[PDB]
Design an enzyme around this catalytic site. Structure first.
Site, mmCIF file in Angstrom:
data_model
loop_
_atom_site.group_PDB
_atom_site.id
_atom_site.type_symbol
_atom_site.label_atom_id
_atom_site.label_comp_id
_atom_site.label_asym_id
_atom_site.label_seq_id
_atom_site.Cartn_x
_atom_site.Cartn_y
_atom_site.Cartn_z
ATOM 1 N N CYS A 176 15.947 -53.210 27.414
ATOM 2 C CA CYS A 176 15.317 -54.509 27.890
ATOM 3 C C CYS A 176 16.800 -55.539 27.698
ATOM 4 C CB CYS A 176 14.384 -54.967 26.823
ATOM 5 S SG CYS A 176 13.733 -56.811 27.016
ATOM 6 N N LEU A 177 17.256 -55.837 28.946
ATOM 7 C CA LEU A 177 18.515 -56.447 28.703
ATOM 8 C C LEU A 177 18.444 -57.555 30.052
ATOM 9 C CD1 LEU A 177 21.283 -57.091 28.387
ATOM 10 C CD2 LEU A 177 22.171 -55.153 29.719
#
Ligand SMILES: [Cl-]
Ligand SMILES: [Cl-]
Ligand SMILES: [Cl-]
Ligand SMILES: [Cl-]
Ligand SMILES: [Cl-]
Ligand SMILES: [Cl-]
Ligand code: NA
Length: 150
Positions: free
Chosen positions: A88-89
């Site tokens: 998750c970025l």
């Protein structure tokens, strides 16, 4: 015509060979320029120091207007990376820009290893430990690095 992604990937690959990173590396898997593998070194002052982490990358048909799909294939204890290696970025989703390159993505992941983001978490248990019990977070991240990434 119709070689947008491939031309961009080829240019990135050329540029990578001319002035590569130090802390990470990447390249295509055989003749499939849409499928790359990468390596990231655990950043030196992080609890991941000494670790080597592998990643798999797939570029989409409409690259560079849509982000690459990137996942870890080495286990890592981190609030933004789950046990399936999903990451998750923001730049891999809503903050993607065609200005970004795979080298910049990998360096951004290195920065995320240095400085996790518990506000955009993927593993809530780890996000809470990171936010409120940093000693424990660091110790667990070190142990996971020693078990899996050395
Ligand atoms: Cl073209
Ligand atoms: Cl060259
Ligand atoms: Cl696409
Ligand atoms: Cl810290
Ligand atoms: Cl072990
Ligand atoms: Cl085991
Ligand atoms: Na942080």
């Amino acid at each position: 015509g119709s070689h947008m992604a491939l031309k961009r990937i080829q240019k990135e690959l050329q540029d990578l060979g001319r002035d590569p990173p130090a802390q990470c590396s990447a390249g295509p898997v055989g003749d499939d320029l849409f499928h790359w593998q990468a390596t990231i070194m655990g950043p030196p002052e992080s609890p991941y120091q000494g670790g080597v982490f592998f990643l798999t990358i797939h570029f989409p048909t409409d690259y560079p207007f849509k982000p690459p799909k990137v996942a870890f294939t080495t286990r890592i204890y981190h609030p933004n990376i789950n046990s399936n290696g999903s990451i998750c970025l923001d730049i891999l989703r809503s903050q993607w820009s065609p200005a970004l390159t795979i080298s910049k993505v990998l360096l951004s992941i290195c920065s995320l290893l240095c400085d996790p983001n518990p506000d955009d978490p993927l593993v809530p248990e780890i996000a809470r430990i990171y936010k409120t019990d940093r000693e424990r977070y660091n110790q667990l991240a070190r142990e996971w690095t020693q078990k899996y990434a050395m």
